[PDB]
């Protein structure tokens, strides 16, 4: 198939840590080795031992016996020690590998993907490949030095049993696997008709309220009694097939063993045998049913492995987010504007967004209110080039969001919210993503206290540097917009798409969150998603998006005067 | 526990077949002993055997295989087949036994319990029963005599080994469980914090909206690369564990195997080893490793079968339907009465039938209207003494149906209906369920062609003769109804409960079935089902019954005139 390829991809992976997979290897030969070693010790142990009237052999016996064993476990642990560290470096890559191109691909994906499976293909997976592909070289390294030593053994102790041996298995295996399909055969053929003699006797007792209004009790009794004399035969016609099936492949067994003593009984064979020597050929060849029985399947499996890292390349191999566009702005004035754009999201038809005309002066803030759709978050996403227009065109300070380059832009840009992600890490650190060292602790105080975050610094040990607990549970909800909003007076931004939807309207400190919104959106471009009526009195210009499309436009008291859809939601006061 | 009072109850049952059990058990016994046999005969192949010069012993050894492997065959199909045959019989007198008190019992009964578990009662419990019961006296003897026989062959062959061995593997088990034990709880500890170390890394790539707009790739990045080192660590610990679980029960089974080989080498024990020897004592421990492994369980299982035999006594020690009262009458005039007669179905309230008086004469029909229910079909079924009045007194004749014997009572009365239960069996013979002999076959045939059943017998081969397909495939519902009325004209009936609700109106040849009808209510009291209105006109006396009360008794024209429940069920037809 093309799992070798795979392989074959996958190798310069590895192929830093060859050293482990090496001592892996020799430490199972060593194993194998010592395993067979100990069934060859099984010869003086009983031809050249009990029989005679040497004790050295059977007082050194059990010291030979241990070393062995010890050797065993100490190889044993080596060998999965190293080989665990070479899985532990290889996942350790592929992880870190797909994980650097999975924080660049675009969003599209992940709202294609939950994040669920994504962890699973990042942890799961690289885990299945790892111990799959790692028991296969274990089994085909360990099992085939243990058959190579077998083989090697049996044909050195005796050459025309070990060949008598070899000859006559397969013979008893096709045997008795042709005996055994048919017999299952005729025991199948015999339930299907079981299955009608049941129903055969179903329709006796559904007539109980017949039988006794006319009296045929004895009849009755009598019909019974035929029907499971029928039955009792056909019970024990099966039960002859069943036990007939076992004694037959018993006695071909016996056969094949009084075949394998009459050959030894042979001149010609009979001289290379004494004693203890067959059982070291025949224990031996008992051992030799377990590996090889284990040998093939494990190869099977090892491709599925390689299936399942064949998925992994798929994603390793995928489309990153285009970078087109060198054009590096900092600090722009800001003069967001949107021309007869049209916008459908990625894998859907229906444009949330189609022939709008936004314009929103650098300072001046627009409003932008609608339902619960309306694709409001779709314009705040779209600022951030999160996503393409399909149609139209975004200007930005005289040039294309295309145009600019995807780091400088998304940079420029603040995005506010209720619902903002708190990673765990310090305050300090959770103040500015990037770039901390840039911002001392002072400058972060400052912009802390500025958005009135510094209250709720004070309230927790260690101040700035206490950590945000796991999934932010030390911070609430209000506390999480405050630290947000301290994030955006940290870092300037020229651009700020301020979203009060999700921002509570029921919690407490509201009003140092509004002064702190207040003192934020002073002398810059806020695009900002209008729910709340005050943030609308305040704004500059307000636009009413609905179905895609701009439908109402002014200053908030000539809204009003319209009396089009933008009084209708105040009626209701935007939701 | 009380399994064993059930065997000896049920121990009379097998006893009559003693013989087969006896010749199991002995076929059974020399199995064993043949197989322990061939293990006692390992040791002259390996001891004066391949070593010596004499090649005698092993020109007759492949003789003495194949003859021991073919008394195994002999005996094991012996011993199946007697013990087959036992259980066959004794199933088959199970079988026969509840069948002859599950068809004297109460249809309330059947009302409780549906027919198809009363068939997996019948069949597949009984099956279960004598199955488990034995192959649970299978394994208990011929186990049991492998292990005598294997401990006897030890203990003969060397006594000091012996004793050595079955002291010291006791020791060896509890070791490798105690130290298997202790490292799966350590695995399972490590696995609780699997758990949280997955979504310790969960909460990274929900922020890819958030990463992106701050540009702190590269620190996410970071924040993985330790993760993702500590992920490697915890599975280095993970595999430490799982590794050093195992060698430690191979390092133990051989300290096991060297102490062995030590006491062996003390010289007070030398004199009863002589090489082959110490095999056939190991390769019987090897063997006695199997049978023990079983015995045990096997004995627990016996229980279970017990158990399930318990549940088959509770049916055949239950409560047959009481035939309380000794009146024996003959072709009964017939003065059916209900006076104030209150009943509810057994285990239910809300009597389906409450104080109603109804008196019906010799010949006079009457026609009991009423809705689906209103306990028309339950009336028919207190005329047959199916069910009980809790309250109230049904008379016939001037006497109780209590008092009556119910015997003659049920045989006088004749149930008619479209459903009748037509069993697999001769047409001449479904005409007279019972006293098929008393009735001629002129008689038969002339009965069928009074009730126009002629028609439709001769059109398919044998005639008379024509036996019944299952569950009544030959014979369709005109005329299963046909052949009822043939059965009811057979045998006279002074008291006829017909049942035209479940008749079709959408049939064929209806103008021969009401023919028939009408020969057949001719000088008998008819208790007629009222559903068709060609039935209530021709009939004498209409009573409506409704809700378990009668609401309008007269002529059909007088019903019809008093504009009651009568006149509203003939606005609809009735139904």
């Given at each position: 198939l093309s799992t070798w390829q795979t392989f074959r991809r996958l190798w310069p992976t590895i192929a830093p840590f060859k050293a482990g997979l090496i001592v892996a290897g020799v430490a199972l030969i060593l194993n194998a080795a010592s395993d067979t070693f100990m069934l060859s010790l099984l010869?003086?142990?009983?031809?050249?031992?009990?029989?005679?009237?040497?004790?050295?052999?059977?007082?050194?016996?059990?010291?030979?016996?241990?070393?062995?064993?010890?050797?065993?476990?100490?190889?044993?642990?080596?060998?999965?020690?190293?080989?665990?560290?070479?899985?532990?470096?290889v996942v350790m890559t592929m992880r870190r590998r797909l994980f650097g191109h999975m924080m660049g691909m675009p969003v599209s994906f992940f709202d294609k993907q939950s994040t669920g499976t994504l962890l699973s293909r990042i942890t799961y997976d690289s885990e299945q490949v790892a111990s799959s592909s790692s028991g296969a070289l274990i089994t085909v390294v360990r099992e085939g030095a243990s058959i190579i030593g077998l083989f090697i053994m049996m044909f050195y102790?005796?050459?025309?049993?070990?060949?008598?041996?070899?000859?006559?298995?397969?013979?008893?295996?096709?045997?008795?696997?042709?005996?055994?399909?048919?017999?299952?055969?005729?025991?199948?053929?015999?339930?299907?008709?079981?299955?009608?003699?049941?129903?055969?006797?179903?329709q006796m007792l559904k007539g109980h309220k017949e039988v006794l209004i006319f009296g045929g009790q004895e009849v009755e009794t009598k019909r019974f009694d035929k029907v499971s004399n029928r039955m009792r035969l056909q019970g024990m016609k099966m039960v002859s097939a069943s036990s007939i099936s076992d004694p037959i492949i018993q006695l071909i067994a016996s056969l094949a063993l009084a075949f394998v003593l009459y050959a030894a009984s042979f001149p010609s064979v009979m001289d290379s045998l004494t004693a203890g020597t067959i059982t070291v050929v025949f224990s031996s060849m008992i051992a030799l049913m377990r590996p090889l029985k284990s040998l093939t399947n494990v190869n099977a499996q090892f491709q599925r492995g390689m299936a399942a890292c064949q998925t992994l390349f798929t994603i390793l191999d995928s489309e990153q987010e285009k970078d087109e566009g060198k054009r590096v702005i900092e600090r722009a004035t800001g003069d967001v504007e949107f021309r007869n754009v049209t916008?459908?999201?990625?894998?859907?038809?229906?444009?949330?967004?189609?022939?709008?005309?936004?314009?929103?002066?650098?300072?001046?803030?627009?409003?932008?209110?609608?339902?619960?759709?309306?694709?409001?978050?779709?314009?705040?996403?779209?600022?951030?080039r999160f996503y393409d227009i399909d149609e139209g065109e975004i200007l930005m300070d005289g040039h294309d969001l295309r145009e600019y380059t995807l780091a400088s832009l998304r940079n420029q840009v603040a995005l506010v919210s209720q619902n903002v992600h708190l990673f765990n890490?310090?305050?300090?650190?959770?103040?500015?993503?990037?770039?901390?060292?840039?911002?001392?602790?002072?400058?972060?105080?400052?912009?802390?206290?500025?958005?009135?975050?510094?209250?709720?610094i004070n309230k927790m040990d260690n101040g700035l540097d206490t950590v945000i607990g796991e999934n932010g549970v030390l911070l609430s909800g209000g506390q999480?917009?405050?630290?947000?909003?301290?994030?955006?007076?940290?870092?300037?931004?020229?651009?700020?798409?301020?979203?009060?939807?999700?921002?509570?309207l029921d919690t407490e400190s509201e009003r140092a969150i509004q002064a702190a919104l207040d003192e934020?959106?002073?002398?810059?471009?806020?695009?900002?998603?209008?729910?709340?009526?005050?943030?609308?009195?305040?704004?500059?210009?307000?636009?009413?998006?609905?179905?895609?499309?701009?439908?109402?436009?002014?200053?908030?008291?000539?809204?009003?005067?319209?009396?089009?859809?933008?009084?209708?939601?105040?009626?209701?006061?935007?939701?």
């Open positions: 010869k003086p142990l009983l031809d050249d031992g009990f029989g005679k009237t040497d004790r050295s052999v059977l007082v050194w016996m059990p010291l030979v016996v241990i070393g062995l064993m010890i050797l065993r476990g100490i190889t044993s642990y080596v060998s999965s020690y190293c080989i665990s560290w070479v899985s532990g470096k102790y005796s050459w025309q049993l070990s060949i008598i041996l070899i000859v006559l298995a397969p013979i008893v295996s096709i045997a008795i696997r042709v005996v055994s399909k048919r017999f299952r055969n005729i025991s199948k053929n015999m339930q299907n008709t079981m299955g009608q003699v049941t129903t055969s006797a179903e916008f459908t999201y990625p894998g859907r038809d229906v444009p949330a967004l189609r022939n709008i005309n936004l314009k929103i002066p650098a300072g001046k803030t627009v409003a932008l209110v609608g339902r619960s759709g309306s694709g409001k978050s779709t314009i705040a996403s779209l600022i951030t890490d310090t305050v300090a650190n959770n103040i500015a993503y990037a770039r901390t060292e840039q911002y001392s602790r002072e400058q972060i105080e400052e912009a802390a206290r500025m958005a009135y975050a510094m209250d709720f999480r917009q405050r630290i947000a909003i301290a994030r955006a007076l940290l870092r300037d931004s020229p651009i700020l798409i301020l979203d009060e939807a999700t921002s509570a934020l959106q002073k002398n810059r471009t806020s695009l900002v998603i209008a729910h709340r009526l005050s943030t609308i009195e305040k704004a500059d210009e307000i636009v009413v998006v609905e179905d895609g499309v701009i439908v109402e436009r002014g200053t908030h008291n000539d809204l009003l005067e319209h009396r089009g859809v933008y009084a209708q939601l105040h009626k209701m006061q935007f939701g």
